[PDB]
Amino acid sequence: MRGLLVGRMQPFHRGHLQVIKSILEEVDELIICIGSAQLSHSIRDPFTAGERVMMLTKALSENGIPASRYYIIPVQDIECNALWVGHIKMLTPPFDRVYSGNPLVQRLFSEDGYEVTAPPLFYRDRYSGTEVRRRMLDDGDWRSLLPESVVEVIDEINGVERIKHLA
Ligand SMILES: NC(=O)c1ccc[n+]([C@@H]2O[C@H](COP(=O)([O-])OP(=O)(O)OC[C@H]3O[C@@H](n4cnc5c(N)ncnc54)[C@H](O)[C@@H]3O)[C@@H](O)[C@H]2O)c1
Ligand code: NA
């Protein structure tokens, strides 16, 4: 029983972490696709896919979730939304259920015949990439929004300096 979760993870935050843990209570393995893998260095998508692979790896590891329970697969975006479900399928192991709070993702997988679950949002007003990046830019408390392993990654790659320069 394998689930699928798609997210840009810009950057991976505590909301992503909560949702993943609960998904792991109902599936054996979780495929985690890092969407928009071709985008980096913009205010909306600051981090490369590879930096995001590291954030994920360190966070899940820090929280003791064994690697054999999930897959991390970067997925570039494509021009045709009508082909995107097939694009994900092509790049991943087979899966039984899809988890997403994104309307487009929900609708595409639904039209393709998949049951889609929209888990309850964990602290939706603070746990969002938008809020994290807004705090990094305006000097607010972004660190408390992310697992500490992710903050370490962001420090090592000079993420704040990057985003501020870009803005
Ligand atoms: N044609 C295409 O190329 C196409 C079509 C559809 C989607 N996509 C890609 O899908 C990706 C989009 O993922 P996104 O925008 O939803 O990323 P995101 O990182 O903002 O959200 C990831 C998912 O994590 C969960 N989540 C996030 N915050 C949460 C919180 N506080 N509490 C609980 N759960 C929470 C939700 O399931 C959410 O949909 C993008 O890369 C997008 O480009 C591509
Ligand atoms: Na994000």
Curated annotation (Swiss-Prot):
<dbReference type="InterPro" id="IPR014729">
    <property type="entry name" value="Rossmann-like_a/b/a_fold"/>
</dbReference>
<keyword id="KW-0548">Nucleotidyltransferase</keyword>
<protein>
    <recommendedName>
        <fullName>Nicotinamide-nucleotide adenylyltransferase</fullName>
        <ecNumber>2.7.7.1</ecNumber>
    </recommendedName>
</protein>
<keyword id="KW-0662">Pyridine nucleotide biosynthesis</keyword>
<keyword id="KW-0547">Nucleotide-binding</keyword>
<dbReference type="GO" id="GO:0005524">
    <property type="term" value="F:ATP binding"/>
</dbReference>
<dbReference type="GO" id="GO:0005737">
    <property type="term" value="C:cytoplasm"/>
</dbReference>
<dbReference type="GO" id="GO:0009435">
    <property type="term" value="P:NAD biosynthetic process"/>
</dbReference>
<keyword id="KW-0808">Transferase</keyword>
<keyword id="KW-0067">ATP-binding</keyword>
<comment type="pathway">
    <text>Cofactor biosynthesis; NAD(+) biosynthesis; NAD(+) from nicotinamide D-ribonucleotide: step 1/1.</text>
</comment>
<keyword id="KW-0963">Cytoplasm</keyword>
<keyword id="KW-0520">NAD</keyword>
<dbReference type="Pfam" id="PF01467">
    <property type="entry name" value="CTP_transf_like"/>
</dbReference>
<comment type="subunit">
    <text>Homohexamer.</text>
</comment>
<dbReference type="GO" id="GO:0000309">
    <property type="term" value="F:nicotinamide-nucleotide adenylyltransferase activity"/>
</dbReference>
<dbReference type="InterPro" id="IPR004821">
    <property type="entry name" value="Cyt_trans-like"/>
</dbReference>
<comment type="similarity">
    <text>Belongs to the archaeal NMN adenylyltransferase family.</text>
</comment>
<dbReference type="InterPro" id="IPR006418">
    <property type="entry name" value="NMN_Atrans_arc"/>
</dbReference>
